[PDB]
């Protein structure tokens, strides 16, 4: 490819964006446990947020 | 008759910059304005209503304009 270098910055965003999502999986200790948003789970809803 | 030569600095480059700036602003300004007008005319804004019993809404359903919800 003559100009493959122009994928260096965008995909480095996307993978980096994905990393932030993984951090949410490490911070779900109080998911559907906060006193303000404690709510019974809807049918066919395993989690309130991902 | 008897017209003289009015000596002035070259205004070609500044006029070229202004033309380029207006063109590059308008090139995406016209599509976004058309998009906002089409959103507001056809799809339109939401209508405020009370929360139905046993139904919880999404977070993006708490806002009025379609672009804000999006």
């Amino acid at each position: 490819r003559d100009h493959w270098i122009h994928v260096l910055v965008p995909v480095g965003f996307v993978f980096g964006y994905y990393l932030d999502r993984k951090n949410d999986e490490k911070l779900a200790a109080f998911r559907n446990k906060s006193l303000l948003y404690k709510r019974e789970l809807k049918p066919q809803e395993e989690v309130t947020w991902k | 008759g008897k017209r003289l030569f009015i000596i002035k600095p070259s205004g070609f480059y500044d006029k070229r910059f202004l033309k380029l700036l207006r063109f590059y602003i308008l090139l995406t300004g016209i599509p976004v304005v058309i998009g906002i007008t089409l959103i507001n005319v056809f799809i339109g804004e939401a209508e405020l209503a009370e929360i139905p019993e046993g139904y919880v809404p999404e977070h993006w359903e708490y806002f009025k304009h379609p672009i804000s919800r999006w």
Partner: protein, 177 residues
């Protein structure tokens, strides 16, 4: 006391300048023309009374006393011509006096609108660059050693050449461009 031609001002020059400014101030005080004529002829008689004075120190004392008289008798706001310094429209059009070298920075697209003018400009620049070395070689051989003693410039001596340092006094912008 600050002149490009002479180092100093002679006594007659001081008397003439005093007569000029005194007549101008009297014209300012005496707006109507006939009254101005009366007092201008009176001032002319007063200047002509001591015309044939041979004692230099007496003439100098009379000059100093006349300066004191004039400074006591000024108009607080005298008449200034509109284009003279201090006037209403002095240096008004200096925003319009664009120097000609900006024409060298013109685009070829706008240079095509004036073909004959730019041909004449090219031949003028050719004449300047043809005569510049002749002008400077005249300048080195004319002035004495130790630098010029006066700001006056020599003219074009020989035939077929131009006076030295002429470009910025010929191509100067017009008063009303």
């Amino acid at each position: 006391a600050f002149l490009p031609s002479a180092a100093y001002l002679t006594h007659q020059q001081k008397v003439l300048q005093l007569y000029k400014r005194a007549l101008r101030h009297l014209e300012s005080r005496c707006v109507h023309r006939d009254k101005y004529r009366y007092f201008a002829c009176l001032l002319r008689a007063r200047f002509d009374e001591h015309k044939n004075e041979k004692d230099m120190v007496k003439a100098t004392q009379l000059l100093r006393e006349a300066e004191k008289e004039f400074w006591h008798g000024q108009h607080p706001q005298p008449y200034i011509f509109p284009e003279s310094p201090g006037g209403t429209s002095y240096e008004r059009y200096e925003c319009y006096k664009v120097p000609e070298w900006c024409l060298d920075d013109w685009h070829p697209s706008e240079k095509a609108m004036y073909p004959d003018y730019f041909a004449k400009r090219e031949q003028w620049k050719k004449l300047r660059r043809e005569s510049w070395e002749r002008e400077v070689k005249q300048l080195q051989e004319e002035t004495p050693v130790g630098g010029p003693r006066t700001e006056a410039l020599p003219p074009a001596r020989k035939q077929g050449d131009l006076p030295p340092l002429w470009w910025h006094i010929v191509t100067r912008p017009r008063e009303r461009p």
